[PDB]
Design an enzyme around this catalytic site. Structure first.
Site, PDB file in Angstrom:
ATOM      1  N   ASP A 112       0.822  -1.205   0.000  1.00  0.00           N
ATOM      2  CA  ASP A 112       0.000   0.000   0.000  1.00  0.00           C
ATOM      3  C   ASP A 112       0.860   1.260   0.000  1.00  0.00           C
ATOM      4  OD1 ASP A 112      -2.442   1.246  -0.150  1.00  0.00           O
ATOM      5  OD2 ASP A 112      -2.853   1.159   2.003  1.00  0.00           O
ATOM      6  N   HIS A 138      -4.365   2.876  -7.378  1.00  0.00           N
ATOM      7  CA  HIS A 138      -5.508   2.528  -6.546  1.00  0.00           C
ATOM      8  C   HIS A 138      -6.775   2.333  -7.363  1.00  0.00           C
ATOM      9  CE1 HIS A 138      -3.169   3.364  -2.904  1.00  0.00           C
ATOM     10  NE2 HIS A 138      -4.145   2.742  -2.269  1.00  0.00           N
ATOM     11  N   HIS A 166      -6.489  -1.073  -8.270  1.00  0.00           N
ATOM     12  CA  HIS A 166      -6.835  -1.886  -7.109  1.00  0.00           C
ATOM     13  C   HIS A 166      -8.341  -2.087  -7.006  1.00  0.00           C
ATOM     14  CE1 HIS A 166      -8.790  -0.925  -3.214  1.00  0.00           C
ATOM     15  NE2 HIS A 166      -8.294  -2.101  -2.873  1.00  0.00           N
ATOM     16  N   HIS A 168      -5.650  -5.715   0.849  1.00  0.00           N
ATOM     17  CA  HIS A 168      -5.772  -4.421   0.189  1.00  0.00           C
ATOM     18  C   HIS A 168      -4.465  -4.015  -0.482  1.00  0.00           C
ATOM     19  CE1 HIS A 168      -6.545  -0.181  -0.475  1.00  0.00           C
ATOM     20  NE2 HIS A 168      -5.561   0.131   0.348  1.00  0.00           N
TER      21      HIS A 168
HETATM   22  N1  LIG Z   1      -9.909   4.922   5.208  1.00  0.00           N
HETATM   23  C1  LIG Z   1      -8.768   4.806   4.544  1.00  0.00           C
HETATM   24  O1  LIG Z   1      -8.072   5.786   4.249  1.00  0.00           O
HETATM   25  C2  LIG Z   1      -8.315   3.435   4.157  1.00  0.00           C
HETATM   26  C3  LIG Z   1      -7.125   3.220   3.480  1.00  0.00           C
HETATM   27  C4  LIG Z   1      -6.750   1.934   3.153  1.00  0.00           C
HETATM   28  C5  LIG Z   1      -7.557   0.871   3.500  1.00  0.00           C
HETATM   29  N2  LIG Z   1      -8.729   1.082   4.179  1.00  0.00           N
HETATM   30  C6  LIG Z   1      -9.592  -0.050   4.545  1.00  0.00           C
HETATM   31  O2  LIG Z   1      -8.880  -0.907   5.418  1.00  0.00           O
HETATM   32  C7  LIG Z   1      -9.441  -2.235   5.320  1.00  0.00           C
HETATM   33  C8  LIG Z   1      -8.329  -3.248   5.225  1.00  0.00           C
HETATM   34  O3  LIG Z   1      -7.643  -3.310   6.490  1.00  0.00           O
HETATM   35  P1  LIG Z   1      -6.736  -4.585   6.806  1.00  0.00           P
HETATM   36  O4  LIG Z   1      -6.076  -5.043   5.555  1.00  0.00           O
HETATM   37  O5  LIG Z   1      -5.886  -4.298   7.992  1.00  0.00           O
HETATM   38  O6  LIG Z   1      -7.845  -5.667   7.201  1.00  0.00           O
HETATM   39  P2  LIG Z   1      -8.521  -6.114   8.578  1.00  0.00           P
HETATM   40  O7  LIG Z   1      -8.872  -4.893   9.348  1.00  0.00           O
HETATM   41  O8  LIG Z   1      -9.605  -7.084   8.270  1.00  0.00           O
HETATM   42  O9  LIG Z   1      -7.318  -6.875   9.303  1.00  0.00           O
HETATM   43  C9  LIG Z   1      -6.630  -7.921   8.580  1.00  0.00           C
HETATM   44  C10 LIG Z   1      -6.558  -9.165   9.431  1.00  0.00           C
HETATM   45  O10 LIG Z   1      -5.450  -9.043  10.357  1.00  0.00           O
HETATM   46  C11 LIG Z   1      -5.818  -9.584  11.599  1.00  0.00           C
HETATM   47  N3  LIG Z   1      -5.015  -8.946  12.631  1.00  0.00           N
HETATM   48  C12 LIG Z   1      -5.113  -7.648  13.056  1.00  0.00           C
HETATM   49  N4  LIG Z   1      -4.254  -7.346  13.995  1.00  0.00           N
HETATM   50  C13 LIG Z   1      -3.549  -8.519  14.207  1.00  0.00           C
HETATM   51  C14 LIG Z   1      -2.500  -8.847  15.085  1.00  0.00           C
HETATM   52  N5  LIG Z   1      -1.959  -7.991  15.944  1.00  0.00           N
HETATM   53  N6  LIG Z   1      -2.022 -10.111  15.040  1.00  0.00           N
HETATM   54  C15 LIG Z   1      -2.567 -10.967  14.171  1.00  0.00           C
HETATM   55  N7  LIG Z   1      -3.554 -10.774  13.304  1.00  0.00           N
HETATM   56  C16 LIG Z   1      -4.008  -9.515  13.370  1.00  0.00           C
HETATM   57  C17 LIG Z   1      -7.308  -9.313  11.730  1.00  0.00           C
HETATM   58  O11 LIG Z   1      -7.907 -10.232  12.616  1.00  0.00           O
HETATM   59  C18 LIG Z   1      -7.795  -9.475  10.288  1.00  0.00           C
HETATM   60  O12 LIG Z   1      -8.256 -10.796  10.046  1.00  0.00           O
HETATM   61  C19 LIG Z   1     -10.410  -2.196   4.126  1.00  0.00           C
HETATM   62  O13 LIG Z   1     -11.758  -2.074   4.553  1.00  0.00           O
HETATM   63  C20 LIG Z   1      -9.979  -0.939   3.368  1.00  0.00           C
HETATM   64  O14 LIG Z   1     -11.044  -0.340   2.653  1.00  0.00           O
HETATM   65  C21 LIG Z   1      -9.118   2.358   4.502  1.00  0.00           C
HETATM   66 ZN   LIG Z   2      -4.380   2.022  -0.128  1.00  0.00          ZN
END
Ligand SMILES: NC(=O)c1ccc[n+]([C@@H]2O[C@H](COP(=O)([O-])OP(=O)(O)OC[C@H]3O[C@@H](n4cnc5c(N)ncnc54)[C@H](O)[C@@H]3O)[C@@H](O)[C@H]2O)c1
Ligand SMILES: [Zn+2]
Ligand SMILES: NC(=O)c1ccc[n+]([C@@H]2O[C@H](COP(=O)([O-])OP(=O)(O)OC[C@H]3O[C@@H](n4cnc5c(N)ncnc54)[C@H](O)[C@@H]3O)[C@@H](O)[C@H]2O)c1
Ligand SMILES: NC(=O)c1ccc[n+]([C@@H]2O[C@H](COP(=O)([O-])OP(=O)(O)OC[C@H]3O[C@@H](n4cnc5c(N)ncnc54)[C@H](O)[C@@H]3O)[C@@H](O)[C@H]2O)c1
Ligand SMILES: NC(=O)c1ccc[n+]([C@@H]2O[C@H](COP(=O)([O-])OP(=O)(O)OC[C@H]3O[C@@H](n4cnc5c(N)ncnc54)[C@H](O)[C@@H]3O)[C@@H](O)[C@H]2O)c1
Ligand SMILES: [Zn+2]
Ligand SMILES: [Zn+2]
Ligand SMILES: [Zn+2]
Lengths: 367, 367, 367, 367
Positions: free
Chosen positions: A171, A254, A257, A271
């Site tokens: 990312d 993106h 993406h 992501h």
């Molecule tokens: N708002 C924004 O600017 C922005 C930017 C990028 C992405 N996002 C959003 O973020 C989301 C993706 O986040 P993600 O990829 O972190 O997914 P997620 O929040 O589902 O977490 C990924 C996985 O990691 C696991 N996990 C978390 N902390 C852990 C730890 N300490 N040890 C072990 N496992 C752990 C969780 O249980 C989960 O299954 C999407 O909804 C995307 O749209 C938002």
């Molecule tokens: Zn991103």
């Protein structure tokens, strides 16, 4: 026009900072509701409760459903009303964090953000991505404020699976190329105006930190330990990439993406893993030099990111699917129209196939 | 320990942005109290109001006394309690801005900061310097929050005296060298932790921006017009220097500036003008390379900053006066103790005389 | 959209090439009408004829009125209809050349262009600037074809006033910066499309040739002799600048030149002399690096070009006059809107004053 | 003596420009005869007819026999007479284009050139190579004019076999080395005189574009899609190489190409494929440095060009055949006599064997 940069009020990063979480959050409110990732609460719920009690704070902990949906937000809204809390603390992955950001907005309260992984640039942004309960994109919820506080425990990040750090590298690796494309194009950032030098310096600093520290941080992540190289990548994946993309700009990487998510083969990849291929698609689109593309492909390969379509489980019907990706990426209002001179669906389709071809050649010359 | 960076939530910069004040300031409150410099209020009151009314906001304007004093806050505290306002807007110079930050702190409301000059790095910082009603230092009021919004009108700043832009250059020119000295020493910043990579990169971007744009911006400042060069120096003087000093740290340059305030000869010089000589003192104290001192001395002279004690009106009893400056610079709690290896009054006294000798040599070899 | 480059079919350059005019011009027609500047016709008529007769060609010579006006074309349109000629030859300056290009357009015959000075990039372009019979601008006649043949006698150009070669240097010095600004903006060129790599390479070769050969060629121009350095600048002033402006694009430098024509103080200066100050205005407008402005200012001064408003006889009411120049430079359809991010009259006015200040500083530090 | 550069009047290059073909050609004539390559007409005849009808033009389409012979030209001359056409449009490979160029010359009409492949530098030149109907070289037909218009549809080029783009890379790769040799030698170009800087800059720009974009364009060509890298190579293979060789000069590489055609083993290989080995022969002849020769051999190998004699099906009787090549290349009036100091048949024979030896060593160190 106007040049704007946004930022969270306070960004804190340290090993075992979860012990000091209560001391840092006390200036914001006395009564707290915590939205917590289930996996994290499994090993850390007692540590979090101790942190609030030792600072004289009142805390309620609500395990997180797993998706940032309006139903999950609405469910937590009622829990917050009953709790009579003055602030929301999100602790977990990007899905937990966006949910706490949206919750605090509807509740009219400050929000603290505690990422347990450096997997996206969600923590610092003033944006929540809303989904349906089935995991399909619903809507963007633009927020008036960045998080008041972002607190990153580098030790907890280190204990997570190393794949989730490489996802964050994917990312953040796009941040510089997408902000650079927006400044070359005069595009409007999500902050509201044109790019500042501060954002462009932070975006380029993100790129060079990943080039210099990316592989050394994956070694520490695989061993689940904290080194200075891991601290620097965590900052690059969080603060640098977040300010870099929100006040620097988004472009083709993106948009690609978003189009890759529409293919069910690659929908469930992380992501940043889908973003990682969008960056290689953009580099073909803007005709980056050979050394630039090889440098990005080498680092992406070194940390375990997909550099071919097949590495995203796209192996059959590739042209028909890359057609679907190219059309979605060029939809009205997509960030691919921030590329200099723009990009047509034909141009993006061409870049998808050639980027895949380049990754295929990289893997062969490697084995 | 933890690494921390702080920042205002939103930094906005653009020509004629005073016309868009109400639209920007709307998501913060609907009722507003304005603490305004009398000279500034005299030429923009109609413009400030029209923007607030056309955005549908209540506004009440309260001329600023001229000094940052508790009595002055208490007077405005009374008007605010009567005004029944939801946020504070400070429009003026560093004194009007520190005053509005303190008023919003005791009132517990957000604060908007509209600098009409780029003379110091006060706008973005989370601190207010308080004085007695006469003008002698009273106390530091270390604030829990940076301003919610900093809005810089580059056209208004262009109309200001060119001397005041040079003063901001002198203040911002210290940012890199003090923050770099703090990371070389591992000192704690005003944010409460060690240096982040973001702060050090913004502090260095400040130094390089002043080197690349400083003299071009003075040309536009003396013509009272806006160019992209003046736009960049305003950002370096406000956001980059503000985040870079607060989250990067201070050192000998500002400790020496404080010691010069104890000499009545230099009272009629602006804040950044005294800091300019403090930076040269620091460069001697840390034994910077000749090319580093020559480049700083050259830029300081090229924009009109003092590089000798005489240019600060210190011409008689120089040793006795420099003994006083060194003693005050080395006081308990001063930032000179963030220098690598510390600094005794004898070392500071030595640097003060030697830097004055260097500035004299430099001016001689320039004609 | 499409990328397009235009060019004359044949560019010939050599000493005493006027003697080989008939042999070169033979494959185009056998009957020829010559539109000739009166001063030039007075010293070469015998040479022009002998070359045409010794090649076995019919020739009829028609002195040029002195201004490019429809009345002047219509008069020559009558002589051409009586002459019953197969092609047109223009021998003289930019006015004689634009006139002959327009005459051959309405007559529907090929055109040969023999510049006797390298003062502008008019010879090769597919456009003619028409004026009223007094000398005030009338209309652009955008032509469907570049000239079939451009034949430059370097010995004749050497005998011309050295001021007129410097004027061509001033015109050609803008080629690179305007074309580079157009590719940075993705603007459309006069050829009707985006920039080709060929045009941008020829425009940059123009800039570097003037830097490497400009001062050496002036020495030969003041001695009225031909050297390889003068040969190269003639090519840069004619072919490289002609293709580079038409197929690379124009920007602020020429929009500012047009605004200066609205000031009667600068009427007695040649075309390239006004463009020379417009280039410096553009370099301030796009905030070029200090070394870029110093190098352009140095070369302009080294050959005798204006780098200040006073050197264009603009010494009184400078702000009021610069308001007029900026307004006209920003008119609808002007090439200043090809600048990256556009340009408002306030930004152009600011650059005009600041560039004048820079030229003043430069001249001071030169003595 | 005189320095000359020739060029087509207009060069257009864009994706799907075949739709706009009618709009671009209308200024030249109303009635058109199209000489079209049979393979191209198989998929594009309806698209071409639509393009002319949508612009209000009258078109007759004559499929092309496959060889640029006097009989094929004479056959089309009669078709043109009956058609009463004002212009000729050639669309296809270099053989189709040279035939249309010769046809329009004998008919006394303008010619537009539409290359469907970037396989040689034929499109822009003022030359047609005439053959016998058996494919043996007949004569050079020097034309008085370059094509009026060259329009390249990058999409159609992309759909062609990737081998035909690599053939164009082989032809264009020689342009810089052959023009550089002519400028070192003071040789006369086909334009009629000595080299200009413009041609030498375009020739060297050709070389560096192929070094930077050659491999990235082959990826797009193999996928039959358009990327910016493919657009740049198409320009290098067409406009840059064409102006580069006609106004820059030819030398040993193309003389060797003519000698290789005399060997029946290699007669049927493509034009640029035989040129590609002539370039490596020239590099031995002029003793290019090791890094230069390795760079050319690496790029030639990377895109699939022959770097050994065996890769041209010359595997038996090599000395007796290389003797035949060396003698033909040194024939009276061949371009090998433009090499600095000239080249004897013994020298060329030596260079052929050693270039073959170098390619053999390159292939071994690769596998
Ligand atoms: N708002 C924004 O600017 C922005 C930017 C990028 C992405 N996002 C959003 O973020 C989301 C993706 O986040 P993600 O990829 O972190 O997914 P997620 O929040 O589902 O977490 C990924 C996985 O990691 C696991 N996990 C978390 N902390 C852990 C730890 N300490 N040890 C072990 N496992 C752990 C969780 O249980 C989960 O299954 C999407 O909804 C995307 O749209 C938002
Ligand atoms: Zn991103
Ligand atoms: N809190 C911090 O981190 C921090 C940092 C640096 C300095 N400071 C404080 O800031 C203060 C210094 O402020 P300053 O140097 O700006 O002085 P100032 O606030 O007195 O302003 C200087 C003068 O500029 C005038 N002015 C302002 N805008 C103008 C305009 N547009 N046109 C014309 N005149 C205009 C004002 O009326 C005033 O007379 C000191 O109290 C210093 O301690 C605080
Ligand atoms: N069409 C285009 O793209 C283009 C570009 C630039 C300028 N122009 C036009 O060109 C014109 C400017 O032409 P110019 O600056 O050459 O002025 P000009 O044509 O009036 O020539 C200047 C003077 O030089 C004299 N002269 C010419 N050759 C001489 C020689 N060998 N020896 C001595 N004196 C000689 C002429 O007699 C004339 O008095 C303007 O109309 C301008 O708009 C057109
Ligand atoms: N006049 C000059 O300056 C000059 C320079 C170089 C070469 N030439 C001449 O050019 C000729 C060689 O041209 P060439 O190599 O292009 O050969 P060519 O014209 O025979 O075309 C090569 C092949 O490509 C096929 N083809 C063309 N367009 C296609 C498309 N869009 N898709 C698929 N297939 C397609 C054709 O059917 C043909 O079989 C020779 O006669 C040579 O002498 C002339
Ligand atoms: Zn300061
Ligand atoms: Zn001009
Ligand atoms: Zn060839």
């Amino acid at each position: 026009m106007d040049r704007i940069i946004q930022s969270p009020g306070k960004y804190i990063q340290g090993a075992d900072v979860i012990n000091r979480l209560g001391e840092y959050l006390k200036p914001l409110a006395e009564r707290w509701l915590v939205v917590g990732d289930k996996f994290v609460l499994g090993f850390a719920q007692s540590t979090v409760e101790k942190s609030f009690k030792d600072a004289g704070l009142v805390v309620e902990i609500a395990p997180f459903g797993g998706e940032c949906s309006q139903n999950e937000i609405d469910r937590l809204r009622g829990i917050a009303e009953t709790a009579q809390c003055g602030a929301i603390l999100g602790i977990g992955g990007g899905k937990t964090l966006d949910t706490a950001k949206a919750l605090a907005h509807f509740m009219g309260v400050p929000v603290a953000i505690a990422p347990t992984i450096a997997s996206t640039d969600a923590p610092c942004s003033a944006l929540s991505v809303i989904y349906t309960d089935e995991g399909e994109f619903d809507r963007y919820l633009l927020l008036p404020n960045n998080p008041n506080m972002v607190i990153v425990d580098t030790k907890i990040v280190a204990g997570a699976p190393a794949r989730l750090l490489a996802a964050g590298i994917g990312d953040a690796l796009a941040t510089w190329f997408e902000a650079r494309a927006c400044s070359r194009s005069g595009a409007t950032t999500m902050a509201g105006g044109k790019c500042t030098q501060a954002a462009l310096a932070l975006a380029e600093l993100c790129y060079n930190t990943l080039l210099e520290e990316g592989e050394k941080a994956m070694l520490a992540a695989e061993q689940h330990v904290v080194t200075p190289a891991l601290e620097r990548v965590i900052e690059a994946n969080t603060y640098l990439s977040g300010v870099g993309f929100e006040s620097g700009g988004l472009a083709a990487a993106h948009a690609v993406h978003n189009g890759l998510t529409a293919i069910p083969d690659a929908h469930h990849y992380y992501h940043g893993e889908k973003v990682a291929f969008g960056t290689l698609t953009q580099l073909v689109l803007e005709n980056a030099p050979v050394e630039e593309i090889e440098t990005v492909a080498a680092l992406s390969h070194a940390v375990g990111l997909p550099i071919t379509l097949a590495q995203l489980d796209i192996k059959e019907d590739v042209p028909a699917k890359m057609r679907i990706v190219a059309e979605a990426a060029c939809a009205e209002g997509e960030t691919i129209h921030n590329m200099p001179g723009g990009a047509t669906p034909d141009q993006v389709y061409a870049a998808l196939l050639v980027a895949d071809q380049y990754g295929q050649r990289f893997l062969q010359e490697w084995e």
